[PDB]
Inverse folding.
């Protein structure tokens, strides 16, 4: 699998937390 893509999407997902609690859309 594409490491750059995985890292990138993971980074983006990490950054776009929205909930403001370290995790993204994982409020649990």
């Amino acid at each position: 699998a594409p490491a750059r893509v995985g890292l990138g999407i993971t980074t983006v997902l990490t950054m776009t937390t929205q909930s403001s609690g370290s995790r993204a859309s994982l409020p649990k």
Summary: The first helix runs from residue 3 to 15. The helical segments are 3-15. The chain has one helix and no strands. The two ends are 29 Å apart (CA to CA).
